[PDB]
Amino acid sequence: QLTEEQIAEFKEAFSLFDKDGDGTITTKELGTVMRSLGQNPTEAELQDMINEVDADGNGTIDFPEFLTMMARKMKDTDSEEEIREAFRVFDKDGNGYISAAELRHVMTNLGEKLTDEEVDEMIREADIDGDGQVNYEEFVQMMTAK
């Protein structure tokens, strides 16, 4: 029951990291993405991140190893502390609502080239109440519900 939709989504996420498109994610590529989000992982942390999933021992992450990384993380995310941390990454002005403009800004900072329509689509997918924004409860639902 893996869908074509889920695969395309994983593919988009992989390509966010794989900025040179060589089909592998290196420590440098992980470092660049986490730094674009205001984090500062050390070389050792980056190596440990790859090591957790590096099935062939080659020092980089390929597609199925990236899928493994994501699946582990989905399973590991129930804590309000982790989810609230992710929420604040997107709720730039801290007003408790992720707007289409805030999501556009974060996507741009990540290097993801998305149309205005694609960003509105993302807000619509997570918006439950229909106010046109994403509140914390809606963000939780998006993260824990699948």
């Binding site: 994983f10 986490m34 992982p41 993302m122 998006m142």
Partner: peptide
Amino acid sequence: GRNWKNFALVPLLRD
């Protein structure tokens, strides 16, 4: 209608 969950998880990868 476009699921964004994988992006929202990225800040949590560091765990």
